[PDB]
Amino acid sequence: KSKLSGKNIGIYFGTFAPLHTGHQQQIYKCASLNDGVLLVVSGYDNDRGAQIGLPLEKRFRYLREAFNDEENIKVSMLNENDLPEMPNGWDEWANRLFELIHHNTLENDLSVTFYVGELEYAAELKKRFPADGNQYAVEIADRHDISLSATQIRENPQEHWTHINRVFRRHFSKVVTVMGSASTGKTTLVRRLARSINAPFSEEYAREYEEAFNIDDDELKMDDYARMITGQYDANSREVNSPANQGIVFLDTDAIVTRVYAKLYLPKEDFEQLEPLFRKTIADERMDLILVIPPITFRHMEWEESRHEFHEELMRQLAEFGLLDKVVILDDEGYLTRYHHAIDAVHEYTGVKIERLSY
Ligand SMILES: NC(=O)c1ccc[n+]([C@@H]2O[C@H](CO)[C@@H](O)[C@H]2O)c1
Numbered sequence: 001k002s003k004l005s006g007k008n009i010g011i012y013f014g015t016f017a018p019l020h021t022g023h024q025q026q027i028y029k030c031a032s033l034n035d036g037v038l039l040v041v042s043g044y045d046n047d048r049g050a051q052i053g054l055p056l057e058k059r060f061r062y063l064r065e066a067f068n069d070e071e072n073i074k075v076s077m078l079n080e081n082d083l084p085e086m087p088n089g090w091d092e093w094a095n096r097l098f099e100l101i102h103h104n105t106l107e108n109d110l111s112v113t114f115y116v117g118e119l120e121y122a123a124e125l126k127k128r129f130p131a132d133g134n135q136y137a138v139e140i141a142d143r144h145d146i147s148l149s150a151t152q153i154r155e156n157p158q159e160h161w162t163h164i165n166r167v168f169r170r171h172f173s174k175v176v177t178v179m180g181s182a183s184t185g186k187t188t189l190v191r192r193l194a195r196s197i198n199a200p201f202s203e204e205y206a207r208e209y210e211e212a213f214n215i216d217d218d219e220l221k222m223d224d225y226a227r228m229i230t231g232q233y234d235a236n237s238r239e240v241n242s243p244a245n246q247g248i249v250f251l252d253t254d255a256i257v258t259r260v261y262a263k264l265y266l267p268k269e270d271f272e273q274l275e276p277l278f279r280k281t282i283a284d285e286r287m288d289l290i291l292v293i294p295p296i297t298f299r300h301m302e303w304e305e306s307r308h309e310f311h312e313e314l315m316r317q318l319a320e321f322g323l324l325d326k327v328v329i330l331d332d333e334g335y336l337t338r339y340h341h342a343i344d345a346v347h348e349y350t351g352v353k354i355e356r357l358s359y
Pocket of ligand 1: 170175177233236237238240241251254284285286287
């Protein structure tokens, strides 16, 4: 009984890559004028949304979540694959459309209104109203501002962040990850970089884990490393998904960093046993900028020594995963300080404005 109730039904179309407040204002007006609204997400393989990593199936799921607390609003999918390109696609297209209306509606003798943004769709739809006992009307709505907003969001999400629907925000987020040995100032750097622009940041999970479970670096076993992989990943996703996210988040280490420690300190067998979880987790990471603190002259007591060992292995692995074009090495102390170098790198890779201190 997950069908739309009522007699006056509005049909609202979009690709929704992403959904934004322009859509939402129109939808809620439409829902105030009708007994219920059917949102139609249209798409096809390798369409505009698919090309930026938002294929039809994902936009449909995101919309369902976005409208998960609405009485009279249903979300449905119009799959446009395998259509004859010319005229005979219009018949089949409409068939699928009216099938969607039939399946997702409770009652009969409806009064249905299509909200349509292109003159071609209106004319083709008006010729193909079926004799199903419903009354149909097509209403032209101006979509120019909505389409332009969508285009501007895709070009520069950080400039239009507050208008992006929250379910879509993770996809468009910029992500800066800091990497380095223990006791090199990562945590101080992360917090200063993030606080400089009101961005959220994560903490190094390994430090929390060793305090909560009260164990030293040299007591870590294979299973601790596994828990640090998922623990750091969850902490990082939490910040990317945080409502405090304004478009840029800072991460204090990641699975690659943990993979460097594992490679250096675990027995070969135990490392090889963690490799699938490493690969899975590293594959789920999205990084735009990787800041590496190189070795120059609560404490991780064993992780302190052999900094150059850690750094060489880290650089090997960043090459192994093809990340070198996102890596900036903070070899200062040219810029005044490590912090000057990093905040400038943040500027170049995210677009955010940074104030000067001096003339
Ligand atoms: N670097 C990260 O840990 C990171 C960055 C962006 C997103 N995520 C998570 O992965 C998923 C997307 O693949 C999202 O659900 C994020 O939580 C993790």
